[PDB]
């Protein structure tokens, strides 16, 4: 899709149609994953996300 964004020091979201932020990294697409209520892959999402420490429970605060 069109919109993307990149993070400044504060974690403040900086929206931009650019595919590359001024810092050289790629630009994260603003939009979340399309959701299906009849999704049975939740166990596998927790398993994988936990391996790489991306789960909500694993962040500070």
């Amino acid at each position: 899709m069109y919109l993307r964004y990149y993070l400044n020091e504060n974690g403040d979201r900086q929206y931009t149609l650019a595919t590359i932020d001024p810092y050289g990294k790629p630009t994260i697409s603003a939009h979340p994953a399309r959701f299906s209520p009849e999704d049975k892959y939740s166990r596998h999402r927790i398993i994988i996300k936990k391996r790489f420490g991306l789960l909500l429970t694993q962040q500070p605060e």
Partner: protein, 345 residues
């Protein structure tokens, strides 16, 4: 070594310091800046009933929470609300702002008892970030910037800013703030007309709904589903406590009046919030102002409208201090202890 000093040193609290200031700026939710509230009376008998907002049991927590959800692109907001109702297995669920089917962003979904606060959120501020395309090219970027500057007012649009603009594709992205009920597609077509070439939207992303924003614990629908599954298999609610947030978080911008634990169930059953049960209050209360009645545990008893200025509440000994607008506390969370007073008897 320091261990030797620990084993040989007195290390006892000093007999006196003469100062007992509290640092309440870091207490959660409606107890922030607690000591700065005007203190009317500290004489009262707390009851063992009721929990603190953040430390409720899981059932009562889900029953009185809200989710700042990142809405997926495709569905209609009411679909998201139905989905959350199904997943969390909660009787009632609603929301304040209805985002268009093809929109994404903040969407405050209230769960089964914060649904009494949806009416109050319908007027709350809102922010967006839109991508738009123009039918024909314009002279320069400054023409667009000026065009945006002419649509900053009662059309309301509190602020606006051209975050990006690509002249090759004639597509740019701008950030807008608007009062609730504003249709940003109308604003974009109006900006197109003002620019003299016309325009229409392609994308939109709500970036704040009131005091709730992108970095304020916004969570995807996947997080909701995973939280429910983790709680329904591992019997773990750390996920479901990160996802849901106590409904007191939406009332943190209101002035507070704390009340005795003996007037809580009276207010639940409708009684007006009379002075004889006000322990503390926030300076700056003006007649006809929305305030929140809070127990001393941080619980949002209700939403009332003030009939007494801060000064009057400081300098008066009887009378009604507020009339109720919405009883957010469920009845019988505290015992019925109205009618045992000295004057009443």
């Amino acid at each position: 070594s320091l261990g030797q000093f620990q084993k040989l040193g007195d290390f006892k609290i000093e007999p006196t310091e003469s100062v007992t200031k509290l640092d309440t700026a870091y207490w959660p939710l409606l107890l922030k800046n607690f000591d700065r509230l005007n203190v009317r009376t500290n004489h009262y008998t707390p009851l063992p009933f009721g929990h603190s907002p953040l430390k409720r049991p899981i059932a009562e927590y889900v029953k009185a929470g809200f989710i700042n959800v990142d809405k997926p692109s495709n569905p209609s907001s009411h679909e998201v609300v139905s989905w959350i109702k199904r997943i969390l297995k909660v009787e009632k669920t609603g929301h304040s702002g209805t985002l268009d089917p093809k929109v994404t962003g903040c969407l405050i979904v209230c769960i089964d008892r914060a649904t009494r606060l949806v009416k109050s959120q319908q007027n709350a501020g809102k922010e967006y970030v839109a991508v738009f395309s123009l039918h024909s090219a314009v002279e320069n970027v400054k023409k667009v910037t000026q065009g945006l500057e002419k649509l900053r007012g009662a059309l309301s649009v509190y602020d606006s800013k051209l975050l990006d603009f690509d002249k090759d594709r004639n597509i740019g992205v701008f950030w807008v703030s608007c009062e609730a009920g504003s249709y940003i597609r109308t604003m974009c077509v109006h900006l197109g007309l003002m620019l003299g070439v016309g325009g229409q939207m392609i994308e939109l992303r709500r970036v704040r709904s009131g005091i709730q924003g992108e970095k304020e614990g916004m969570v995807t629908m996947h997080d909701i589903l995973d939280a429910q599954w983790a709680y329904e298999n591992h019997k773990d609610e750390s996920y479901l406590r990160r996802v849901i947030k106590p409904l007191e978080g939406l009332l943190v911008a209101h002035k507070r009046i704390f009340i005795k634990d003996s007037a809580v169930n009276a207010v639940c059953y409708g009684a007006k919030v009379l002075l004889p049960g006000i322990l503390r209050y926030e300076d700056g209360i003006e007649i006809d102002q929305e305030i929140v009645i809070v127990t001393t545990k941080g619980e949002a008893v209700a939403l009332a409208i003030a009939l007494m200025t801060t000064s009057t509440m400081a300098s008066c000994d009887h009378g009604v201090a507020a009339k109720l607008k919405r009883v957010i506390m469920e009845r019988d969370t505290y015992p019925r202890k109205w009618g045992l007073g000295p004057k009443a008897s």
